[PDB]
Amino acid sequence: EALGLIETKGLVACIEAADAMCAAANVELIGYGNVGSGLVTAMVKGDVGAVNAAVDSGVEAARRIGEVVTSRVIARPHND
Amino acid sequence: REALGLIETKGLVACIEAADAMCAAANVELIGYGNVGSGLVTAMVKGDVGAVNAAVDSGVEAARRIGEVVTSRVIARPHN
Amino acid sequence: REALGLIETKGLVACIEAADAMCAAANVELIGYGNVGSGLVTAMVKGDVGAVNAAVDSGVEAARRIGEVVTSRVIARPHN
Amino acid sequence: REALGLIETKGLVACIEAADAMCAAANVELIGYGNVGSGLVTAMVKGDVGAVNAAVDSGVEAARRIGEVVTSRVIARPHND
Amino acid sequence: EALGLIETKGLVACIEAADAMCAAANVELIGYGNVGSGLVTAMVKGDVGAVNAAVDSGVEAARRIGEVVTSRVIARPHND
Amino acid sequence: REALGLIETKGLVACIEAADAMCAAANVELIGYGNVGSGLVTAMVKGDVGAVNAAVDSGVEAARRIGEVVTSRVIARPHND
């Protein structure tokens, strides 16, 4: 399954990105990843069409709240 | 099926104040705190959307007296 | 059912000094420390509101000699 | 008894991409990630030195599109780990 | 027992401070305290004369290596 | 009764390089790493003071190629640890 990734500065922007990802398309929230320095990543799972649509509006919603530092869709992940 | 209120502050003391002012302002229940490092700490509350909007509103006002409020949000119908 | 005193400092050593000076100043009980990274460390005390106000007052005075007092607060009637 | 490739990025998303791009580029095996705070995250791969050199090369190219590649390295014959 | 505290930017300066404290006088290393942001604290225990001599040359030693951000001797700690 | 060698770097990859070059340079044994956040991570080695001085010396040279060496130290007769 494809993997969608949005990393934000701060936890609240990330929760919003994750909520907007799961509202926008048929993706499943995998969880969050925190590496300190305020960087938090929301991770979603689905078909590449859904994941591309989820990440797209996850990024738009998060930018209203705060800092989106990077985002990515990986259509065919090798690990995880 | 409960709304979610979120206040993120720079520092723990502003966050405790935000959480205390949220719980004093309306019929919301504190879920806990979330810390992602960099000094960013998030208070999270639960309730009906009217109560949550009133708590976050005065939670933000109280915290700003103490310190830095970096972001806030009410999510009326959270997906995850 | 007890008031709460809070001092957040830049660095661990100032915080230990604030906490020692709080507990020497009045009949307050150290609850523990809270660390949210970024060097921010919070000393937390418990007592009647008169004692807690006297503890925090001289806790802040002591810590400022050593280092940075970034925020402080007395919550006379904490909700959590 | 195997070479080690290392890519350190600013942020978690660049690192996952580097790790995905390393494992797609050559016959390397992801060992895991290492996080030391300050946003610095390191993907670590294992393989023969030819494969590991090719994985890191394109891992760095992939990550740089996404974000900050702060350092990278191939250790052909590691003494520890 | 008195408590001596040296906080440095970085782990190597702190290990150096702790080694120089314990070499200078009859103090006993309690451990380290790390609160992130690179701040690390060496803590020693002993009679107040020893702890004052330990902290003094721990501070001198650490400064050769790196950044000493604060230091303190607490002659009669109320907690810990 | 053994000396301690210490190299602290900004970032995990420089530190692994320092640690590998310490163990390649002399008869020292890697104790482990120490991370205090802010990107600062420390390689720690054990051995006779001559070996430890030789290891730390070239551990620092190797790491400086990759990244930032923020501090280093040899403690010939450590009181604790």
The token duo for B44 is 């999270």
In C, which residues are within 8 Å of E77 by CB distance?
20
Chains in touch with A (≥3 Cβ pairs < 8 A): B, D
Strand positions, DSSP E, chain C = 3-10, 29-35, 40-47, 68-75
Contacts of F17 in chain D (CB under 8 A): 73, 75
State the nearest Cα–Cα gap between D3 and chain A, in angstroms: 19
- CA dist list (Å): C11 to A36, B33, C67, C69, E49: 18, 21, 8, 10, 25
Q: Do A37 and D39 touch (CB under 8 A)?
A: yes
Select from B80, B24, B62 the least CA-distant residue to B72. Answer: B62
Resolution at which this structure was determined, Å: 2.1
Paired tokens of B11: 């520092």
Residue of A nearest to D26 (CA): A78
Q: E45: which chain C residues are within 8 Å (Cβ-Cβ)? A: none
Q: Are A43 and A74 contacting, i.e. CB atoms less than 8 angstroms apart?
A: no
Distance CA E3, CA E51 (A): 7
CB contact under 8 A, A10 and B72: no
Our CA-based measurement puts residue C13 at a distance from the nearest CA of chain E, in whole angstroms, of 7
Reduce the DSSP state of residue A36 to 3 states and report it.
Answer: coil
Q: Determination technique for this PDB entry?
A: X-ray
Strand partners, A42: A6, A32
Residue F73 in tokens:
């130290």
Burial B39-76 (b: 16+ CB within 10 A, else e): bbbbbbbbbeeebbbbbbbebbebbeebbebbbbbbbe
Distances in Å between the Cα of F25 and the Cα atoms of A59, D25, F21, F59 are 49, 33, 6, 8
D29-35 and D3-10 as β-strands: parallel, antiparallel, unpaired?
unpaired
DSSP summary character for residue B15 = H
Residue type (1 letter), E72: R
C-alpha–C-alpha distance, residues B43 and B25, integer Å? 14
CA-to-CA separations, F21 to C27, C80, D2, F18, F67, in angstroms, rounded: 56, 53, 17, 5, 14
**Residue type at F5 in one-letter notation:** G
Chain C residues whose C-beta is within 8 A of a chain E C-beta are: 11-14, 16-17, 19-20, 23-24, 30, 35, 37-41, 66-67
Alpha-helical regions (H) of chain D: 12-25, 49-66
DSSP state, E78? S
Residue in chain B nearest C73 by alpha carbon: B13
Distances (CA, A) of E14 to E4, E11, F73: 13, 5, 11
Closest-CA residue of A relative to B33 is A11
Q: Is C28 helix (H, G, I), strand (E, B) or coil?
A: coil
CA dist E59 to A59, E41, E42, F9, Å? 49, 12, 11, 22
Touching F: which chains, 3+ CB pairs < 8 A?
D, E
CB half-sphere exposure, D81, CA atoms < 13 A: 23
Contact A19 B72 (CB under 8 A): no
Give me the helix-helix angle, E48-65 and E11-24, nearest 10°: 140
Q: What are phi and psi of B26, to 5 degrees?
A: -155, 180
Residue D51's CB is within 10 A of a number of other CB atoms, namely 20
Instruction: Output DSSP code: residue D4.
Output: E
Nearest to C57 by CA among C45, C40, C67, C41: C45
Contact status, residue A40 vs residue A33, Cβ threshold 8 Å: yes
CB–CB of C40 and B39 under 8 A?
yes
CB contacts of C75 in chain B (<8 Å) are 16-17, 20
Q: How many Å apart are CA A11 and CA A38, to the nearest integer? A: 7
Relative to beta strand F3-10, strand F68-75 is antiparallel
Strand order in the sheet with F40-47: F29-35, F40-47, F3-10, F68-75
Residues contacting residue C1 through CB under 8 Å, at least 6 positions apart: none
Backbone angles phi, psi at D70, to 5 degrees: -90, -30
Between CA F56 and CA F18 the distance in angstroms is: 8
Cα(F55)–Cα(A20) distance, integer angstroms = 52
Instruction: Find, in chain B, the residue whose alpha carbon is nearest to that of C33.
Output: B12
**Is D14 in Cβ contact with A70 (below 8 Å)?**
yes
Reduce the DSSP state of residue B54 to 3 states and report it: helix
Whether residues A71 and D24 touch (CB distance < 8 A) is answered with no
> If you write DSSP's letter for every residue of E5-71 in order, what string do you get?
EEEEESHHHHHHHHHHHHHHSS-EEEEEEE-STTEEEEEEEE-HHHHHHHHHHHHHHHHHHSEEEEE
Residue A40 to residues C13, D81, F76, Cα–Cα distance (Å): 29, 28, 42
After what residues is chain C interrupted, C–N > 2.5 A? none
Cβ atoms of E9 and E76 within 8 Å: the answer is: no
Q: What DSSP character marks residue E1?
A: -
- Tell me which residues of chain B have a C-beta less than 8 Å from any C-beta of chain C: 11-14, 16-17, 19-20, 23-24, 30, 35, 37-41, 66-67
Chain C: give the shortest CA distance to residue B35, in Å: 6
Task: Report the amino acid identity of residue A73.
Answer: V
